């Protein structure tokens, strides 16, 4: 499979999540995603084919994971935006007030702005601390997907937010959305990964 930020993948033939970013760890290919999407050793599938397994994750507390892929997968420095693509150029962290977009299998590519950092989400499983908050909308299934600026600086992966009864927070105003992402920087250093860029 071609690995692009934002596409769907399933875990153990049950849950769906979105790919965050293509990365490498020495000769190993992988992608970063949300920790809540899978447990260590869970199987990831793209379009019904096995592409790899969860190599590590932290959830709750943090919400991060990386999936190690088989050698036949093609890593690309890109994030899906409809039929188009955003090129990944690095991981400079943007500040509060910056515009950012996110990509995922449920709501597609949505943009907004960063409104706060260091937010705590109180999920049913336990608190997840240090998340950054944006006001781009998102829906169930978007988890693990990319958060990136239009300039190509990868920001983090989708964690969660105030989903309404229709499964997303797209039908409420930007001012009332809380869409939280886990910062990419600490995931790359915790697992020794390097981002694929173009």
């Amino acid at each position: 499979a071609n690995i692009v930020g934002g596409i769907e993948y399933s875990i153990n033939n049950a849950s769906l999540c979105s790919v965050g970013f293509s990365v490498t760890r020495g000769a190993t290919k992988g992608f970063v995603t949300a920790g809540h999407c899978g447990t260590v050793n869970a199987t990831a599938r793209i379009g019904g084919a096995v592409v790899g397994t969860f190599a590590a994750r932290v959830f709750p507390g943090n919400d991060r994971a990386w999936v190690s892929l088989t050698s036949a997968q093609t890593l690309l420095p890109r994030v899906a935006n409809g039929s188009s693509f955003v090129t990944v150029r690095g991981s400079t962290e943007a500040a509060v007030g910056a515009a950012v977009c996110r990509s995922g299998r449920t709501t597609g590519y949505q943009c907004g702005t960063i409104t706060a950092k260091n937010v705590t989400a109180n999920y049913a499983e336990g608190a997840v601390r240090g998340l950054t908050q944006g006001n781009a909308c998102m829906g169930r299934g978007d988890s693990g997907g990319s958060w990136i600026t239009s300039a190509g600086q990868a920001q983090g992966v989708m964690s969660g937010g105030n989903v309404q009864s229709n499964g997303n927070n797209c039908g409420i105003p930007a001012s009332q959305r809380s869409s939280l992402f886990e910062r990419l920087q600490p995931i790359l250093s915790q697992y020794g990964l390097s981002l694929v860029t173009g």
Binding site: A34, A121, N122, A124, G139, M158, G161, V163, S178
Partner: peptide, 4 residues
């Protein structure tokens, strides 16, 4: 908030 809920995970996703």
């Amino acid at each position: 908030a809920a995970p996703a």
